[PDB]
Nucleic acid binder design. Structure first.
Ligand SMILES: [Cl-]
Ligand SMILES: [Cl-]
Ligand SMILES: [Cl-]
Ligand SMILES: [Cl-]
Ligand SMILES: [Mg+2]
Ligand SMILES: [Mg+2]
Ligand SMILES: [Mg+2]
Ligand SMILES: [Mg+2]
Ligand SMILES: [Mg+2]
Ligand SMILES: [Mg+2]
Ligand SMILES: [Mg+2]
Ligand SMILES: [Mg+2]
Ligand SMILES: [Mg+2]
Ligand SMILES: [Mg+2]
Ligand SMILES: [Mg+2]
Ligand SMILES: [Mg+2]
Ligand SMILES: [Mg+2]
Ligand SMILES: [Mg+2]
Ligand SMILES: [Mg+2]
Ligand SMILES: [Mg+2]
Ligand SMILES: [Mg+2]
Ligand SMILES: [Mg+2]
Ligand SMILES: [Mg+2]
Ligand SMILES: [Mg+2]
Ligand SMILES: [Mg+2]
Ligand SMILES: [Mg+2]
Ligand SMILES: [Mg+2]
Ligand SMILES: [Mg+2]
Ligand SMILES: [Mg+2]
Ligand SMILES: [Mg+2]
Ligand SMILES: [Mg+2]
Ligand SMILES: [Mg+2]
Lengths: 62, 169, 98, 386
RNA sequence: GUGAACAGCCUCUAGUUGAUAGAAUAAUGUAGAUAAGGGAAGUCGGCAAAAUAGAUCCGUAACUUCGGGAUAAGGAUUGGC
RNA sequence: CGUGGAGGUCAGUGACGAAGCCUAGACCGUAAGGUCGGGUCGAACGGCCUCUAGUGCAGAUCUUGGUGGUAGUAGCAAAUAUUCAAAUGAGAACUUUGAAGACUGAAGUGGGGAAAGGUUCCACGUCAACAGCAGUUGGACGUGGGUUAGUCGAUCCUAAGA
RNA sequence: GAAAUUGUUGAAAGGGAAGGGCAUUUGAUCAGACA
């Protein structure tokens, strides 16, 4: 499959960069059918697509 | 189709060919000569060993400034290589020829490579860019491959001398 | 046959003098060569968890010793997994019961 | 026009070509002149280089500044297990040079020599010398007849010997076979001596002795392909030089229109046959003797082997020869020790040498202790032992 | 964040992970480096390289268009708690 | 002696094979050349007497086109760096997803525009050619979709000038 | 469907070029008269 377009849509719908988008590798068939933005929103709701946490930049030593 | 010069019975032979194949002509010629005259089963097993770098293809004509290996001792040379792309094209045609022989009804145990020939196909053109804004050619050398598998007065003085000897002993 | 054993591989002497940018990739190929010697299988598969352990300290920070769990499965192939231990020192080859 | 300034030529033209030696075992191309009024004895011996160490001794040299004073010298140790005689060979004189007439072998040969006759010993059926041993199955007519031919016609007699490499820490398992001339006695005496020593061993102390000058023949250490700067010692070109500076600038004049053989060129360095002469023997050790490395002044019980063993070689457990200076070849390499071809009396020979101390510190670093006992006394007790 | 600093060096957001590859480590190269003792003897020529280097304090000549020369030269100090 | 064309003639040769081409096969001539057999081929062509010329090539760093040796050779080495597994496929060092290791380090390898380009934007299908390795991928190939203004610009004003 | 150039098969020669002239040996091949 080719999920390049799904990751681009997921980043825009969620509101983060493509580096913070997680696609479930076990649900490739389901993700491949999500061609619209509404379908992407459903996959975010049920946890098939999730937002990844930001990398910590601690200022404790500062 | 018309093949090259052959001296085998057409009723005991099967043939295969491929045209305009984008594989090196020089590499393919060496590979074709390596199995010329061999049995079909031995040649097929030998080509598989070449892909695994167990045995090498000897280079005899187009071999200037190439490396030398110990695997050339089997064929009495020093320079040999492993042309994987040429081997795969030959393997396909050997498979097709064996299939054609089976359709005819030939005995696969007696099959040996009786004819194999590589010709130069028309070249394909590309460009390369050189220093000071010059253009040179950048071309391939395709091949035509074909092969055939086949089942395995006396004078009076002379007359007098001969007659004379007969009545003596 | 089907057998599982635990090994310790000395990567310190196998990466001696290797370029820094290639040490971690080189350790992957040494492990595949290591498994072929002990199991005789051309097909060697490494778990991604083992890959993380190799690359734990970057491209040039490969640990001196690793404890490996090598299993030969059904013609045959080897599967290499990491063994979670406090230290890899002083351990010898043992057979793991199935 | 003539060169502006005169300098000596770089290199020696008598060692050409600088090519790899034909065999790893260097050839003995000359033997000492035979004296028929002497008992039969060997003229050479085979051994393996182990390493180098340091000794201290008094200097006996009247008129010298360091007369009757201690000096420090470097020595080389050669591991020399006894060799086994396994045959004889006869040579006859011909207007075209010496020619081998016949070869007679011993009845029984060990697996060490038989390995020399194979390239795939683990696959062979070991049929070598099986039919030849049947020559002894009779009363011995075939062997005796061959021995009679050597006595009748041969003018030079040599014996075939091989090393007992299984006694060395080496991993080769394959013995080295070589020919050694026999000097002394008549041709009949040489043949009788060789026959009685079949399957027997000859020790090094029966060939050489203390304070004797010997020659070492071996192949030097190999270094592969080398440039002219280090292969021949030519001057490096200035830093400004384009296209490289480790070169010779001019390799010849316009005429003759050829590169001459006497111009330095890049190529193989090392792995050459060499023959170095005038090496004095400092000690002929015994393998079965404890305190090989002890002297009359040290008296400690220690072997010649340094702490931790000889680097890249191992331990010395057989007879050895200690020779002053350095020897061609590297460690583990087979070397040939040859008796001198002439009587030397330069007052450097004929000088009695008595060792006062032999270094046995570790050669794997900056060793500080001669023996493990000395190390324990200095350091005391460590956590490991308690 | 370090620091005088839009310097150099490390990181977050975001973006890439693209440039034919595999094996081996000869000579000669290109790029980056280190050298005992001597210290320009090298060379057309100190070319190249090395040495000096921030900040605080002390001290600073001939000459001069009195504005400079000047960071002249020449010395000391620097962490952590 | 040979070539293109022209007048006359041989009521000349020819699809039962003209012309051309190939032929270490044969014959004639000192030679330029001429004739025959065999193979290939498919529609026109020749002997003799005369007429006529854009009428004969080994070269001109000749013109155009085609093809070699060099040679599977020089080379495909700037911009720190890749690795494991799964999915897809005839086929994966290079496609997708996940995991890990890295870099640009806000005067960026980030986010927008002006000039210029003109559909390169997006989707589906697809790999002969192109991406100086590869390719299931693509700014490639085939077929379609997409740019919405009273307030953003043009339009209006004048500058050097025309 | 010519030549340069190339593959296969067949024949022959080859000690730092190859090619040529006169003469004959050997191999291969071939016409003419049987009056
Ligand atoms: Cl051009
Ligand atoms: Cl000389
Ligand atoms: Cl170098
Ligand atoms: Cl004529
Ligand atoms: Mg060459
Ligand atoms: Mg080359
Ligand atoms: Mg270019
Ligand atoms: Mg240009
Ligand atoms: Mg220059
Ligand atoms: Mg040492
Ligand atoms: Mg110095
Ligand atoms: Mg000077
Ligand atoms: Mg000078
Ligand atoms: Mg300078
Ligand atoms: Mg015709
Ligand atoms: Mg011809
Ligand atoms: Mg027609
Ligand atoms: Mg003209
Ligand atoms: Mg011409
Ligand atoms: Mg001319
Ligand atoms: Mg020209
Ligand atoms: Mg190359
Ligand atoms: Mg380059
Ligand atoms: Mg790069
Ligand atoms: Mg950087
Ligand atoms: Mg960084
Ligand atoms: Mg696009
Ligand atoms: Mg390509
Ligand atoms: Mg391709
Ligand atoms: Mg298109
Ligand atoms: Mg046609
Ligand atoms: Mg032709």
């Amino acid at each position: 499959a080719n999920l390049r377009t799904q990751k681009r849509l997921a980043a825009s719908v969620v509101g983060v960069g493509k580096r913070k988008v997680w696609l479930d590798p076990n649900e490739t068939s389901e993700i491949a059918q999500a061609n619209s933005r509404n379908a992407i929103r459903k996959l975010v709701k049920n946890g098939t697509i999730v937002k990844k946490a930001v990398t910590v930049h601690s200022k404790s030593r500062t | 189709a018309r093949y090259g010069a052959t001296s085998t019975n057409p009723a005991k032979s099967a043939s295969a060919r491929g045209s305009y194949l984008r594989v090196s002509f020089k590499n393919t010629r060496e590979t074709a000569q390596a199995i010329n005259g061999w049995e079909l089963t031995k040649a097929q097993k030998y080509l598989e060993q070449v892909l695994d770098h167990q045995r090498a293809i000897p280079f005899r004509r187009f071999n200037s400034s190439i490396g030398r290996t110990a695997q050339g001792k089997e064929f009495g040379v020093t320079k040999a290589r492993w042309p994987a792309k040429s081997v795969k094209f030959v393997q396909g045609l050997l498979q097709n020829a064996a299939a054609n022989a089976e359709a005819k009804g030939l005995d696969a145990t007696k099959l040996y490579v009786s004819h194999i020939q590589v010709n130069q196909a028309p070249k394909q053109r590309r460009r390369t860019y050189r220093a000071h804004g010059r253009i040179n050619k950048y071309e391939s050398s395709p091949s035509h491959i074909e092969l055939v598998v086949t089942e395995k007065r006396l004078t009076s003085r002379q007359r007098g001398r001969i007659a004379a000897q007969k009545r003596i002993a | 046959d089907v057998v599982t054993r635990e090994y310790t591989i000395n990567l310190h002497k196998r990466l001696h003098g290797v370029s820094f940018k290639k040490r971690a990739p080189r350790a992957v190929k040494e492990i595949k060569k290591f498994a072929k010697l002990h199991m005789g299988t051309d097909d060697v598969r490494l778990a991604p968890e083992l890959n993380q352990a190799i690359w734990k300290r970057g491209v040039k920070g490969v640990e001196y010793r690793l404890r490996l769990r090598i299993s030969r499965k059904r013609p045959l192939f080897s599967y290499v997994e990491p063994v979670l231990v406090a230290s890899a020192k002083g351990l010898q080859t043992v057979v793991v019961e199935e | 026009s003539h060169r502006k300034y005169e300098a000596p030529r770089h290199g020696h033209l008598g060692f050409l070509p600088r090519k790899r030696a034909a065999s790893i075992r260097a050839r003995v191309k000359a033997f000492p002149k035979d004296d028929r009024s002497k008992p039969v004895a060997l003229t050479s011996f085979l051994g393996y280089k182990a390493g180098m160490t340091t000794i201290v001794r008094d200097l006996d040299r009247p008129g010298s500044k360091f007369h009757k004073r201690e000096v420090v010298e470097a020595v080389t140790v050669v591991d020399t297990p006894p060799v086994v005689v396994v045959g004889v060979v006869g040579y006859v004189e011909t207007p075209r040079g010496l020619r081998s007439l016949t070869t007679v072998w011993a009845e029984h040969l060990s697996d060490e020599v038989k390995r020399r006759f194979y390239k795939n010993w683990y696959k062979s059926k070991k049929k070598a010398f099986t039919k030849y041993s049947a020559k002894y199955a009779q009363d011995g007519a075939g062997i005796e007849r061959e021995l009679a031919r050597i006595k009748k016609y041969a003018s030079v007699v040599r014996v075939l010997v091989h090393t007992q490499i299984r006694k060395t820490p080496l991993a080769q398992k394959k013995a080295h076979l070589a020919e050694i001339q026999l000097n002394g006695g008549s041709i009949s005496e040489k043949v009788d001596w060789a026959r009685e020593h079949f399957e027997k061993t000859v020790a090094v102390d029966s060939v050489f002795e203390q304070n004797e000058m010997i020659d070492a023949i071996a192949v030097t250490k190999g270094h592969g392909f080398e440039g002219v700067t280090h292969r021949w010692g030519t001057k490096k070109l200035p830093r400004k030089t384009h296209r490289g500076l480790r070169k010779v600038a001019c390799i010849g004049a316009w005429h003759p229109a050829h590169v001459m053989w006497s111009v330095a060129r890049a190529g193989q360095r090392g792995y050459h046959s060499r023959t170095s002469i005038n090496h004095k023997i400092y000690r002929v050790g015994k393998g079965d003797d404890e305190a090989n490395g002890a002297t009359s002044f040290d008296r400690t019980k220690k072997t010649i082997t340094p702490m931790g063993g000889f680097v890249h070689y191992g331990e010395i457990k057989n007879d050895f020869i200690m020779v002053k200076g350095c020897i061609p070849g590297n460690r583990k390499r087979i070397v040939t020790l040859r008796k001198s071809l002439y009587t030397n009396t330069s007052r450097k020979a004929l000088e009695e040498v008595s060792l006062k101390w032999i270094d046995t510190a570790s050669k794997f670093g900056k060793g500080r202790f001669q023996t493990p006992a000395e190390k324990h006394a200095f350091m005391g007790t460590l956590k490991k032992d308690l």
